[PDB]
Amino acid sequence: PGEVEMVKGQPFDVGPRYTQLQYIGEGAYGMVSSAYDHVRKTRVAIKKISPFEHQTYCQRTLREIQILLRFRHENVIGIRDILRASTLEAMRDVYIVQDLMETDLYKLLKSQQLSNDHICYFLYQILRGLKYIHSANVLHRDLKPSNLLINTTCDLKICDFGLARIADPEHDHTGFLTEYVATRWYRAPEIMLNSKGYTKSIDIWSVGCILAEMLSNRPIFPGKHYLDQLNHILGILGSPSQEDLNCIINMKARNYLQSLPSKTKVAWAKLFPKSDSKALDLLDRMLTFNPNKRITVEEALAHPYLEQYYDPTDEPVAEEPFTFAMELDDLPKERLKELIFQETARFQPG
Ligand SMILES: *CCC(=O)Nc1ccccc1Nc1nc(Nc2ccc(N3CCN(C)CC3)cc2)ncc1Cl
Numbered sequence: 001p002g003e004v005e006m007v008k009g010q011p012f013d014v015g016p017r018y019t020q021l022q023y024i025g026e027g028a029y030g031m032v033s034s035a036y037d038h039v040r041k042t043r044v045a046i047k048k049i050s051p052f053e054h055q056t057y058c059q060r061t062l063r064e065i066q067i068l069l070r071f072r073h074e075n076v077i078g079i080r081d082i083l084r085a086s087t088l089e090a091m092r093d094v095y096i097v098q099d100l101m102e103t104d105l106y107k108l109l110k111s112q113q114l115s116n117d118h119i120c121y122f123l124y125q126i127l128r129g130l131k132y133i134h135s136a137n138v139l140h141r142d143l144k145p146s147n148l149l150i151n152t153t154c155d156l157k158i159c160d161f162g163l164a165r166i167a168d169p170e171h172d173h174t175g176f177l178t179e180y181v182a183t184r185w186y187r188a189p190e191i192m193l194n195s196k197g198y199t200k201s202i203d204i205w206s207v208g209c210i211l212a213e214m215l216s217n218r219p220i221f222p223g224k225h226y227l228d229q230l231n232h233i234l235g236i237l238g239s240p241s242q243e244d245l246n247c248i249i250n251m252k253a254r255n256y257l258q259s260l261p262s263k264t265k266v267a268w269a270k271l272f273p274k275s276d277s278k279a280l281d282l283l284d285r286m287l288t289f290n291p292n293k294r295i296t297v298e299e300a301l302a303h304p305y306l307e308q309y310y311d312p313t314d315e316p317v318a319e320e321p322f323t324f325a326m327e328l329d330d331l332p333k334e335r336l337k338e339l340i341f342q343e344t345a346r347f348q349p350g
């Protein structure tokens with residue numbers, strides 16, 4: 001009693017309110033457990049984050065905490081509680097308490113073919129969530145099936161906001177083949193050509209890839225390495241039009257694109273011969289090569305595919321947009337640590 005429960009050889013020091021911990025899964029500097037909450041008498045998810053040796057991990061922890069404490073929406077995961085030591089020097093890790101969900105879309109797509117009904121309704125919930133996120137000018141930037149939690153009543157919640165940023169269209173440009181952090185398979189084509197992923201179109205692309213994946217139970221663009229990802233995308237979308245090329249003036253990007261043999265766009269109905277044609281039309285508009293011609297989240301919700309669920313009076317938006325200065329990303333990790341201490345203060349003490 002009063003012990004420190006181990007999860008996979010890692011102490012999870014969340015007693016006495018939270019006990020009976022079981023492993024759920026891991027990310028790069030994070031481990032998630034389920035636990036019993038003795039105060040609310042229910043099982044919860046607890047994420048242990050140990051970020052304070054790396055500036056980039058600190059950036060991501062603060063970013064996710066600042067965003068999720070300020071968001072409240074049915075299709076976005078909430079923060080219920082945060083535990084950390086009483087003093088800054090003692091604080092070596094942070095525990096984020098969240099609603100325990102049954103599964104993720106990744107798991108579900110590995111285990112079963114979805115009906116059209118389920119595909120449609122998951123897509124709607126993803127877009128409903130994303131409307132709220134984008135209404136605060138926040139970009140998720142890492143939407144994929146494993147970042148979509150699902151419970152036993154088919155409720156879906158978006159999670160993992162560690163790579164989120166504010167839409168910043170004035171500084172989106174970068175060079176050809178610039179390094180990128182988000183999961184390769186869900187990266188839009190422009191990430192590899194001229195874009196830092198600072199506009200809302202990059203989340204729409206990822207949602208397109210998720211729809212494709214829900215229709216066929218496999219990733220649509222599974223690149224084996226950075227450039228291969230672009231090549232997979234162009235293999236299906238075909239040779240960009242001249243109008244779309246003329247929006248790219250990075251010389252190396254254009255010359256790469258212009259070196260490829262001519263190829264016409266593959267008909268979605270040929271890749272997805274047994275899918276609803278309305279779903280394929282929406283997929284077409286989400287996976288457009290040119291980010292400027294890609295459908296917006298509002299337009300996607302209004303699309304005929306989602307018509308059984310579409311209800312703009314029941315699709316709320318955030319109070320107010322958010323701002324995060326570029327200079328945050330240059331703060332020493334000791335300063336990020338103090339901001340995480342501050343942001344988590346309102347949940348003290350145990
Ligand atoms: C939301 C992003 C994130 O933290 N994802 C993640 C990754 C691994 C483990 C847990 C987890 N987060 C949460 N999980 C749940 N519920 C839940 C998710 C996944 C499973 N399975 C474990 C094995 N695979 C990772 C998928 C199936 C079970 C339960 N609830 C809340 C959070 Cl934050």
Ligand SMILES: C=CC(=O)Nc1ccccc1Nc1nc(Nc2ccc(N3CCN(C)CC3)cc2)ncc1Cl
Nearest residue numbers: 230231232234235236237238239240259260261262263
């Ligand atoms: C939109 C573009 C597209 O997908 N078109 C295309 C059409 C046919 C085959 C491949 C491709 N594209 C790719 N091809 C390459 N490299 C490559 C270079 C030359 C050739 N030739 C050599 C001689 N030529 C006469 C025919 C084949 C083949 C492949 N890398 C990446 C890709 Cl994505």
